[PDB]
Design an enzyme around this catalytic site. Sequence first.
Site: not given
Ligand SMILES: [Cl-]
Lengths: 245, 245
Positions: A175-176, A12, A114-115, A171, A147, A8-10, A173, A39
């Site tokens: 949710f992810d 993470t 990533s989103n 991740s 996602k 995951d990017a954001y 996140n 965010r």
């Molecule tokens: Cl995200």
Amino acid sequence: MIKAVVFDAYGTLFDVQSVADATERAYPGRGEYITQVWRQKQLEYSWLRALMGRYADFWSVTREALAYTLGTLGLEPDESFLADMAQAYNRLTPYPDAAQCLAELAPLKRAILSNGAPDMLQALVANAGLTDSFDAVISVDAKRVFKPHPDSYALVEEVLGVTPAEVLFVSSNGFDVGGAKNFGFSVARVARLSQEALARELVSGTIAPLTMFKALRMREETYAEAPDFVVPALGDLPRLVRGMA
Amino acid sequence: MIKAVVFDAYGTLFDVQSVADATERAYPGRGEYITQVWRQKQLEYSWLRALMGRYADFWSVTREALAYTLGTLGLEPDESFLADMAQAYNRLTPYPDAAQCLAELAPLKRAILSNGAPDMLQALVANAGLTDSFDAVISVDAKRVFKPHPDSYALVEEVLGVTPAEVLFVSSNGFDVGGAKNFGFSVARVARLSQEALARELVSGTIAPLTMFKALRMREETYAEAPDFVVPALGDLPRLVRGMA
Ligand SMILES: [Cl-]
Ligand SMILES: [Cl-]
């Protein structure tokens, strides 16, 4: 066996709080507030657009979220201003141990799911100096969903040729983590905020806005399947994978 | 022509803040915090489960969100305690001007379209003594999705036999306003928080929790199509409809 580590990017690999100086310099005294709501609404809008079947890429989402956030303060900056400030999301600072982590995972396939929109991710990774740390940087854009929609995770096999069972998804996140588990990946969650500290912070007296974000965003979601692993930092991943299979 | 007025339930006809005294028991000193995070996560979970394609009705969502919320405070209540406390959502107080509004809206068709599970809505409506004010109380459960998924709104024509164009959809929730406009209804948004008051509130030194909830939940969402009409209260709808026709 694990043949690929998908990140995951954001939140993470990249710190979403690192837009603080930009949001603050741009609007004194309002930086921390803006950083959090930006965010939060960025996430909400990715979910809401996708669930309506009204996709728009993360760049449009990021700017819509910013406009809403500045709006709550009574500001109405034009599209040119929004596009310029939104660039901050393409300059997020990588976590200090991301590079070393990715280096130690060199034997395995390394990728980002990533989103983020294509151009965002490229800039983001290039500015972090992590371009050579990935075999693929995958955007959900091709699928026109966000996602935790299952199609977002389907892209991994399509691009890397590995099955869900051969993927370790990483991740920070909730949710992810839930989306990746639902889809069938093994998951390592990065938990940087200890539950016991949040609990005490939430009772340490008047509850600050930054603690609000943490309470909404930094925990495992109760509807989601638990992650296979939980590490406190990215640097723990190489060793986690070693004594894994 | 408008042949039916379809109401959003939670936040629109019923005060989600009215769980205040129930939460203020689950943790004296933290009722306000719980009230806000509970409602926020309740919404997020409905969006995330649906988007993930892992539906569970609003009664499970409501309980999962409560468990998450209390968990942030360090509590680990059992299923019996959660199911018992979650009942607070089936006892929400209707807004003072709801009954009057519904009465003056007859003989037009009157209905509820809500994320709430069937038994929740029935208990909620019955406790408020509004059972005879509605031609139908429609739960999204039939479609096994949550708003703003288009299938949620599709139920309206299935139950009332009126086309989208003949529906005035009422909601205080920006994501619901967005989904109903997306689907094709005419929409009246109930806006109880003046933008200018929020902007100033967010500027007045330290930012409180309820304020954080308000900033996140009481505005029009930037990605959404604007509502056809905006009124300050439910009591204004009958006049809106008249001056409308
Ligand atoms: Cl995200
Ligand atoms: Cl709702």
